[PDB]
Amino acid sequence: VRPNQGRNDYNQVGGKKRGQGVQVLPETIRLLIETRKAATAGGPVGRQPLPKATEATGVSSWGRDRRFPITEALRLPTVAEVNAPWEGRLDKVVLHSGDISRLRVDATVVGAVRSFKT
Amino acid sequence: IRPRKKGMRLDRRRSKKQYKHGRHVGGWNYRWLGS
Amino acid sequence: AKVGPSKGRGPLLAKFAPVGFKKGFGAIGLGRHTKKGFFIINTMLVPMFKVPDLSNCKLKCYVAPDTYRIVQQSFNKRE
Amino acid sequence: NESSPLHMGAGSANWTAVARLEDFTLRGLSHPPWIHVSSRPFYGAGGGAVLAACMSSAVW
Amino acid sequence: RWWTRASGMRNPVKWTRDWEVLNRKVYFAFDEREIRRSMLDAVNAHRKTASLFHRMINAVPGVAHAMSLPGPHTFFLPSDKACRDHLSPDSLHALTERVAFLEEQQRQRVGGTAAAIADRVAKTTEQLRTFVLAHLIPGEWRMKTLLLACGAGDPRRNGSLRYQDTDRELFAPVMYASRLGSSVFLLPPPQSTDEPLPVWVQASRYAAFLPITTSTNFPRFERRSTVGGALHLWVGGALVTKGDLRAHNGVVHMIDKPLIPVQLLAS
Amino acid sequence: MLWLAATHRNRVAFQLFATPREPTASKAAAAARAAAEAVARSSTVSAPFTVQKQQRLLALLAASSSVADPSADLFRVHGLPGFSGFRPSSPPHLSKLFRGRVSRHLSCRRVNHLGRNNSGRITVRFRGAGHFRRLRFVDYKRGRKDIFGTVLRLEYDPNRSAHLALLQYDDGVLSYILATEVTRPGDRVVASKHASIAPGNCLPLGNIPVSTIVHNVELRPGAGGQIVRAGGCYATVVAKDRHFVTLKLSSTEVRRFPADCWATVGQVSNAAHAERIRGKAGVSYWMGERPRTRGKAMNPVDHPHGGGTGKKGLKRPPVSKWGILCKGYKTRAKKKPLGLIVRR
Amino acid sequence: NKVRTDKKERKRAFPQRGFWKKQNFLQVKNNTVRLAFAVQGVDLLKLKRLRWGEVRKGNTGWWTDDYRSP
Amino acid sequence: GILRPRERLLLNALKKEADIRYRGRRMHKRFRSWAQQRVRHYWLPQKVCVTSDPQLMDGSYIAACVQKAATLRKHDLQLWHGFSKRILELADSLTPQQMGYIFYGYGKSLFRHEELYRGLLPFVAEALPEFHSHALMTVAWALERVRVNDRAVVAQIAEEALAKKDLMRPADFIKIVNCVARMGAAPPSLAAALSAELMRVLDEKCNALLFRGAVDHVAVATLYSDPLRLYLLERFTKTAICCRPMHYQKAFQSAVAIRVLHPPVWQQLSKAVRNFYIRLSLRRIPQRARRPSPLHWDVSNALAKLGVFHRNTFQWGCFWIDIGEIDDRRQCWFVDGPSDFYSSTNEYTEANKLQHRILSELGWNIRRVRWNDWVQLGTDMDAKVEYLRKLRERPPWPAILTDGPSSSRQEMVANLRSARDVQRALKERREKNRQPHSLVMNL
RNA sequence: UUUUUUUUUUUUUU
RNA sequence: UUUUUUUUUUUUUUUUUUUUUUUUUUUUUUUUUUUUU
RNA sequence: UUUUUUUUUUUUUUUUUUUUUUUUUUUUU
RNA sequence: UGGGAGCGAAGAUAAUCUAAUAUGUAACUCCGUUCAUGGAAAUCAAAAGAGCUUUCACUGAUUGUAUUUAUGAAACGUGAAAAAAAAAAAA
RNA sequence: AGGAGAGCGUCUGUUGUACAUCAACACUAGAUACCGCUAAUACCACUGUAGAGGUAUAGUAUAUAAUCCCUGCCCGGUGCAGUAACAUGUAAACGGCGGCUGUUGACGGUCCAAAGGUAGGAAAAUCCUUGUCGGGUAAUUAUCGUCGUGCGUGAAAGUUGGUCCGACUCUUCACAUGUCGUUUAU
RNA sequence: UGUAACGGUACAAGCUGUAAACAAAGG
RNA sequence: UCCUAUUUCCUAGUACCAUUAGUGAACUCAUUUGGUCUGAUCCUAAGUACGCAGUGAGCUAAAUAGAUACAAGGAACUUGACAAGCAUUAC
RNA sequence: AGGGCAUGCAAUACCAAUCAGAUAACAACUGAA
RNA sequence: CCUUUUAAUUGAUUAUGCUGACUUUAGUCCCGAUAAACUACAGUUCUGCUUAAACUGAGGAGUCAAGUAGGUACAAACCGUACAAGGAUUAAUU
């Protein structure tokens, strides 16, 4: 039987090694999800007379509700402004880190296939 | 030390006992560098 | 002591020990152990040796002795 | 009195000695003692640029 | 990571070298070996092979209880193939219909027609029990036991089984250029039959080619079954393909022909 | 073997093992009632199973029942020379017991302590390591209510002085039970309050008639027989109460038990276990015994008896190794209040 | 031991009469070496026996000089 | 504890038996090794679903799917045909990389479907300039495996390979050459250029491991010039150690064919070189297990009924013979099949023609039996016997093998379908005769 | 005491 | 009778697990869905 | 042929040792 | 570190033995030393009066505990060194 | 390490000793005492473990020694059991068991006590280092048989012992023999 | 911080850390 | 067309570490020629169709430790039958 | 200090109930430092 | 030099005293079971023991110690020796 006996950790029921293929019940999952969901329950505040800018120029946007935000191209900083100190050339170039799709621009360059099939 | 005896003892480096003396080649009064 | 590093024996090694002692000399892994004693080797973990072309190289290991004087003479011109 | 390197290494080795309620202040040839040994001396008339003094406090 | 880890070929343990003592362990490890599994276990293991039999055993009561006794027994398990190729279509269909009828009766239980059903089941159960039990033979009879019994080991009776040769010039012309240009043994009667069972042996086709690839020391003289082995055992004119299925209750042999009693045999 | 949380229990909220088969519990209740009524219809015997009746049945069973007169010549392995003298007592087809191996799924390895506690010191003196043994899974609780079970064979228990029986239910589940002196391979048993008064049958104390031989009596409701399990032991019914049953044990002790508890009818098997005579110390050596050294042949420091020489005599009472008397000295807590004990 | 660490110097203290000579084994070993060189065709014994400044081409010796009077 | 004397003996004997048994197992195990290698520098990072909607799939998706299916050996008709159908629709939006993958998958799977090859070939032909080493190799490799000769495209492939020699891989270059030689689409000039480039490739960027792959008897005697022949033969000797039976066989075959066809070149070799080959033949070369085909068996039965003794299968030095007569060993028959001819045609393959000519040179009375001619006979034995008898009385085949008449996919399909039922009816009739059916139960 | 494409997982057994 | 082995893995059976998966090495063979048996 | 790795079986760690260096956008060629 | 906290026996003296001294000493664990410890009166004194805490000298080997062997920097008081009640309602 | 008489005696097995040179321990067997489950008992971290995953044909403690043999009297006495809320029961538990005097003496007087050595063995693992008589020898006090006084032992304290058995003392018979008077040669 | 192992140096009670006894010249 | 179905399968150049393959107790110990001799197995052997191993010289003193052969007597020796002897002799 | 500086001393403590280890689901579960 | 001072622990044949050297006993004691031959015209010395086969398609049937003990010029030195694929298809070259 070896002298391993007497220790409280001897033949312990349930372990890290023992349990390697066991998953938590959906109850826990549901609970957690719900808990997280129910953290920002409240009424509206502020003012929203006019709809949020979510469409291209010209075309109006009142009925088309969009859950996702849209970023403006004309509002981004330039490379020169970025690299400027504290107090063609790089005066009209912007290097953006984001979703191209979700960008309001005049034109977008896309790489299509030879057959031009989507 | 036997297996049974060794299974119920901790390491000496786990305690502060190693920083409570001044034994050195010079003598019994050791001063740490940059003291 | 009869047994141990006390007579110029040095640290224990595979050679000087019973069968079963696991001790290498430093290497790089190239696979993994299966559940039956086999070993699947992977070619992905092998290092790559990069060497430029040496078919036409004018340079040599050493420098001609006459170089010293020529280099020196250039200094005096700057004076 | 038999010779057993397994026994020897399992009861009297570097990792087995640390678990011993002994006087570690004594110097040990083949052991990890805890006695301080005063290090490298002061500097004479050599190059000041090549005098080593620290490592674990300076590694970067 | 211990004193010694060598295994397999490099066995640290020391074993006896004496051939005399070694010759005694083989007997104990082969003849006096113990088995935990029963006859039924063995039978079931080959359920795929003998589905008919496997189903009849578990369908008709009585046979299951009979084939679980502590006394030694010998059993024969005919193959589905054998049954199929031996039995006529009408007999095979009739047998399968009655087996299915009994299975349906048991399924109905677990789940003048009433009077007629009792008579039909009573007659069919007895017929199938009689059919089934015919194979069972008291006592333990091994393949070697039978072989030896048949005079396979007697030098005075091995004349037609030891010396065998064939035309080597026709099968190995390159290696031969100069040539170019038994008794019946009676077994105890079955449980449900009084008639004995004759058993004999025969020489295989393969046996007539050993000298071409083996060292022979013969003295101076003056369809074919595809099953392997030098010798073929015929138990009542049924060939045995497999045997020596030792168990806790006895032995099981697979035969290539279903044994049918005279009581069931037609005129 | 099992964990403390898995083995330790004070309070029990159940006295039966239910295995419903219908889709709905409403149908299962009706099925259980139907099964109970079916067992009640079959039950026919209600007289007490007395010693005299036991005797009379044993005489019939062991006088004329056993007659086969078989052809043992063919029941043997042909062509097996066997050992050079070593032969079994009897063949497997004529032995009392089963000539085989215990079930693999109904047994486990035995942990030998050698009479040593956790501290590692010797606690129990004269404790050896004999032949290897396997722990048996004996079903002490008759949870299976309203169901019949037939006996297949009888097994040997090295750990017990009595024989076992391989019980098989109609559903085909195998289980071990404590056998009896009457029970033979083929006999059927059932556990239910509506069952008849027959050997093997398990019924409540209250339902059990007066002056009835019983065994495997449980202490608490649905706990298992603990008071009588050994071979040749049995208890008797003396009196009866609305909530208590008076029982006479094997030690001539009168005690009251709950009316709710279960009990078996009959006598434990292997009644003649106390008749064997060991011919040599080899039997004790194999059984797992060790030599016993008397204290008389010890030093004074080792044993009080040491040094002092003397025969039977009458002056100085003997003293054990522990410094405690061992002749007529009661060992029981006087403060411990007597419970259901009537007459001690 | 080559390291000279064991108690093998104890017996040597006492005087002795003589010691074994593994001539049988040594002879065999020498013979095997001789054979291994002979198959190639070089004489080892000859070279191990010739006088310091002595020249003897082939299988020749004192005997050779006998008949070679001229 | 302690054990019974009886049990002790049995346990010890059992234990001993175990040892004996274990000793007795590793006998034939010679070539095994605990260590092994697995190729992993080809799988894609992206995850796909084979069981997905083909419509939602794209070129990239489909390409991945095809290869994953092949690797997992998920041979499903229902699955593969949907892939083919979607591929046909998306044929106009396939990258060279994707195409190659598709091809590799198909080839590895051995999915015999000409309808897709024929449709994907033209698009490959247009994208040849943008093709790469891997794509180029996979195309040809797949084509070769599926046995669909295309001299119009295969040649172009080779030419593009030669153009991109500076960027190609030695292995792919070698495989291209091999494929080309087997398909027989290289004119003399192309052959010459290929040979010249191959020699430099082999001598500059080839090792022991890579060199072995350049050994091919069919290629050697039909593509390779004398200067490359000699170098190949000489380097094989040196690189023989690091070889396999598969390469050994090929080498031997090469030697034999060279000797038989090109005496001059053979004599031009050195003594040492010659000795190698001389000694090689004496060694026992392992071979895979072989057995007669159903066609083979039918032919053999007809022949035996005609009353002629012969053999089923046997080896003759370096070449296998279908049928060999015992009365006249000189005689030999060969049973062809669909695989013996190119897809939709009856043209013999280069290996078949080379083996025919080598034996004809060596003096073997060689006869050939086709399958499309045979099938027509149906399940009649007298017609087959007469068919065989009429052939026997006629002279043997010429040294130089010729091709058969024209054919078509339609005809091929028809023939196949027809034969399908014959092979089943004959089996049923054969199997039924074995059943005695004598036993009659009263019941 | 596990033998040749790697993992997870269920019953029986010479 | 002093009442004796089984888990990793192999084989068989039962299946809706998974590139954590078998050469892009090679041979042989009449051959395989839906609107050719 | 062993050792290595799963199980027996144990951080009952054999100092300067390992399939073990930060844990997959890997540029599939 | 003979500093502080927990626990803490014996050899020895009493010419053996109990208390007692040794000694709250030795071993074990912990704090880590003037940037510490301590502390600004419900104290001491007695019929006057001193005025947080801390070091040295004398009073004094006096008083007291013990006894067969010892132990005891006692309290008030005097001299001297160093001197310290509170920065303060917020912005 | 053989033939025969006789004393002692469960060995096989473990080991060098409780005096005078000649031992112990263990054991087949029987018998007594405690204990009804969270058992008794043991270790002595105390809601623990062993006992035991057992259940009065079970567990543990003490003493004796063959499978059988007939196996004596005594509770005044320490202790335990019981309770008049200090009778009575336990000797197979617990120390042991005798004076004067009268006729070889069945018998008679008297003192004391709970009871007053039973039978058997008996010159002894005990008194005495020569008790009477018989067997052996040219001599026997050594030793066997026997008598039962000379002193004395003493019954589940283990006495006696039929048959069988023997690395246990002793008597006695037979072969060879430098043990020998008494010593030689290689 | 203090030390042990391996490697180099001239194999060493020193030095040293595969860059293992030095960069000294940024127009 | 009378086979138990006429169901393609040699073998991918291969990570790190251990190793003196034979006789011999080769282990603690040490008065250590490693290896011969001292005991059972492993070879159907006229001892294996030549295998392993073998260390200064001289000399009639006596005594001691042993071997072989002793006339007649045969326990007269010794506390004791300790020791020694018998167990091979026409072939 | 221009540059470089393998490996070992078992390290989430530049923080935080205690009790094995890469520092342990409650409870079982206990403690002079 | 004289004179004053010195807490130097300041004084030797001996505690079988501690640490070393060197005499006497004292050219005393101690020496392991079996050797011989290598010539002046050919050859096989005696003895003890008896697992001494190295491809036959099969890794010689195992473990452990030696902290590398049968390599090497009549060397206790220096210098070497551990290949699981057996590299010499080295059947050729000269």
Closest CA to F342 of F271, F238, F270, F260: F238
Whether residue E182 contacts residue E200, with contact meaning beta carbons closer than 8 Å, is answered with yes
Interchain contact, D30 vs C5, CB within 8 Å:
yes
Technique used to solve these coordinates: cryo-EM
| Three-state secondary-structure class, residue F178 | strand
- SS3 assignment for H336-384: CCHHHECCCCCCECHHHHHHHHHHHHCCCEEEEECHHHHHCCCCCHHHH
Task: Spell out the residues 6+ positions from residue E190 whose beta carbon is closer than 8 angstroms to its own.
Answer: E133, E134, E135, E136, E137, E197
Structure tokens of A99? 């979703």
Neighboring chain E residues of H17 at a CB cutoff of 8 Å: 25-26, 29
D57 touches strand N (CB under 7 A): yes
Q: What does residue H39 show for φ and ψ, rounded to 5 degrees?
A: -75, 130
Task: Please give the DSSP secondary-structure letter assigned to residue A51.
Answer: P
Count CA atoms closer than 13 A to F73's CA, side-chain side.
Answer: 2
Q: Give the whole-angstrom CA distance, residue F29 versus residue F20.
A: 9
O30 C1' – E3 CA distance, angstroms? Answer: 27
Cα→Cα distances H410→D58, E100, H232, H405, Å? 83, 49, 44, 15
Pairing of strands H314-316, H319-321: antiparallel
Q: Give the whole-angstrom CA distance, residue H127 versus residue F241.
A: 104
First to last CA, chain E: 78
| Three-state secondary-structure class, residue E104 | helix
D38 touches strand N (CB under 7 A): yes
Q: Give the whole-angstrom CA distance, residue A104 versus residue A53.
A: 10
- Write the single-letter amino acid at H424: R
- Write the single-letter amino acid at E175: M
F251 touches strand M (CB under 7 A): yes
Q: What does residue F64 show for φ and ψ, rounded to 5 degrees?
A: -135, -20
Longest Cα–Cα distance in chain F: 81
Q: Is A5 on the interface with F (CB under 8 A)?
A: yes
Q: Is D14 on the interface with B (CB under 8 A)?
A: no
Cα→Cα distances C30→C25, C34, C41, H37, H44, Å? 15, 13, 6, 10, 21
Which nucleotides of chain P are near protein (any atom < 7 Å from a CB)?
A: 1-5, 9-10, 20-23, 25, 27-30
Whether residue H171 contacts residue H161, with contact meaning beta carbons closer than 8 Å, is answered with no
Structure tokens of E59? 């369908």
Task: Spell out the residues 6+ positions from residue A65 whose beta carbon is closer than 8 angstroms to its own.
Answer: none
Q: Report the neighbours of B using a cutoff of 3 or more CB pairs below 8 angstroms.
A: A, D
Interface test with B, best of D23, D34, D40, D56 (most B CBs within 10 A): D34
Q: Which secondary structure element, helix H or strand E, spans residue H386, and what is its range?
A: helix H381-392
Across C1-79, the runs of DSSP E, i.e. the strands, are 31-33, 39-41
Structure tokens of H268? 């031009």
Q: Is the dihedral of CA H233, H238, H243, H248 positive or negative?
A: positive
Task: Spell out the residues 6+ positions from residue D50 whose beta carbon is closer than 8 angstroms to its own.
Answer: none
Interface test with C, best of D3, D7, D8 (most C CBs within 10 A): D8
Q: Is A7 on the interface with B (CB under 8 A)?
A: yes
Cα→Cα distances E46→A89, E52, E142, H73, Å? 87, 11, 19, 31
- Write the single-letter amino acid at H395: P
First to last CA, chain D: 53
Structure tokens of E208? 């007539």
Minimal CA separation from E15 to chain C, in Å? 21
Closest CA to F182 of F263, F266, F264, F250: F266
Whether residue F216 contacts residue F222, with contact meaning beta carbons closer than 8 Å, is answered with no
Nearest-by-CA chain E residue for H435: E85
Cα→Cα distances H190→F328, H225, H254, H261, H265, Å? 120, 12, 22, 22, 22
Closest CA to H147 of H113, H119, H173, H97: H113
- Write the single-letter amino acid at G25: F
DSSP string, F227-282: S--STT--EEEEEE-SSEEEEE-TTS-EEEEESSSEEEES-BS-TTGGG---SSHH
Q: Give the whole-angstrom CA distance, residue H25 versus residue E8.
A: 12
Q: Is E3 on the interface with D (CB under 8 A)?
A: yes
Closest CA to H16 of E19, E31, E22: E22
- Write the single-letter amino acid at F125: R
Cα→Cα distances D54→B33, C53, D35, D46, Å? 11, 43, 19, 18
Q: Which secondary structure element, helix H or strand E, spans residue H257, and what is its range?
A: helix H245-261
Whether residue D16 contacts residue D10, with contact meaning beta carbons closer than 8 Å, is answered with yes
Q: Is A14 on the interface with B (CB under 8 A)?
A: no
Closest CA to E66 of E138, E121, E118: E138
Closest CA to E251 of E267, E235, E227: E235
Interchain contact, B3 vs A7, CB within 8 Å:
no
Q: Give the whole-angstrom CA distance, residue H36 versus residue H148.
A: 35
Buried b (16+ CB within 10 A) or exposed e, A72-81: eeeeeeeeee
Which nucleotides of chain I are near protein (any atom < 7 Å from a CB)?
A: 1-9, 12-14
Task: Please give the DSSP secondary-structure letter assigned to residue E253.
Answer: E
Task: Spell out the residues 6+ positions from residue B6 whose beta carbon is closer than 8 angstroms to its own.
Answer: D16, D19
Query: Of F5, F111, F118, which is closest to A6 when you measure between CB atoms?
Result: F118
Query: Of F75, F92, F98, which is closest to E139 when you measure between CB atoms?
Result: F75
Q: Give the whole-angstrom CA distance, residue F143 versus residue F82.
A: 46
Minimal CA separation from E127 to chain H, in Å? 7
Minimal CA separation from F158 to chain H, in Å? 14
Query: Of H34, H40, H41, which is closest to C38 when you measure between CB atoms?
Result: H34
Task: Spell out the residues 6+ positions from residue F235 whose beta carbon is closer than 8 angstroms to its own.
Answer: F213, F214, F215, F217, F227, F228, F247, F248, F249, F250
Task: Return the number of other C-beta atoms located less than 10 Å from residue C67's C-beta.
Answer: 9
The torsion defined by the Cα of E61, E62, E67 and E69, in degrees rounded to 10, comes to: 130
B17 touches strand L (CB under 7 A): yes
Cα→Cα distances E174→E168, E171, G48, H246, H286, Å? 10, 9, 59, 27, 20
Q: Give the whole-angstrom CA distance, residue H412 versus residue F101.
A: 67
M175 C1' – A116 CA distance, angstroms? Answer: 133
Burial class of residue F253 in the structure, from the number of CB atoms within 10 Å of its CB (0-12 exposed, 13-18 middle, 19+ buried):
middle
Minimal CA separation from A6 to chain F, in Å? 6
Task: Return the number of other C-beta atoms located less than 10 Å from residue A12's C-beta.
Answer: 10
Q: Give the whole-angstrom CA distance, residue H26 versus residue E69.
A: 42
Residues in A 87-116 with any Cβ partner in H closer than 8 A? 113-115
Interchain contact, C22 vs E1, CB within 8 Å:
yes
Structure tokens of H112? 């015999």
Q: Give the whole-angstrom CA distance, residue E236 versus residue E234.
A: 6
Nearest-by-CA chain D residue for B9: D19
Q: What does residue H334 show for φ and ψ, rounded to 5 degrees?
A: -140, 125
Structure tokens of F285? 């050596």
Task: Return the number of other C-beta atoms located less than 10 Å from residue G46's C-beta.
Answer: 13
Q: What share of chain H is helix, strand, coil (3-state, %, to 5)?
A: 60, 5, 35
Q: Is E15 on the interface with D (CB under 8 A)?
A: no
Interchain contact, E265 vs H441, CB within 8 Å:
yes
DSSP string, F288-324: T------GGGS-TTT-TTSS----S-SSS----TTS-
Q: Is C55 on the interface with H (CB under 8 A)?
A: no
Nucleic strand Q contacts from chain E, 7-66, CB < 7 Å = 9-15, 17
Whether residue E102 contacts residue E125, with contact meaning beta carbons closer than 8 Å, is answered with yes
Nearest-by-CA chain B residue for D54: B33
Q: Which nucleotide is nearest to C25 (CA to C1')?
A: K17
Minimal CA separation from E124 to chain H, in Å? 9
F329 touches strand M (CB under 7 A): yes
Whether residue H337 contacts residue H372, with contact meaning beta carbons closer than 8 Å, is answered with no
L57 C1' – H261 CA distance, angstroms? Answer: 133
Minimal CA separation from E266 to chain H, in Å? 5
Nearest-by-CA chain E residue for F102: E36
Q: Give the whole-angstrom CA distance, residue H215 versus residue H272.
A: 20
Task: Return the number of other C-beta atoms located less than 10 Å from residue H183's C-beta.
Answer: 23
Closest CA to H90 of H99, H101, H100, H80: H99
Neighboring chain B residues of D54 at a CB cutoff of 8 Å: none
Q: Give the whole-angstrom CA distance, residue H169 versus residue H133.
A: 7
Burial class of residue F116 in the structure, from the number of CB atoms within 10 Å of its CB (0-12 exposed, 13-18 middle, 19+ buried):
middle
Structure tokens of A82? 């970025």
Q51 C1' – G24 CA distance, angstroms? Answer: 21
F341, β-bridge pairs? F255
Q: What does residue H422 show for φ and ψ, rounded to 5 degrees?
A: -65, -45
Structure tokens of H146? 């599926």
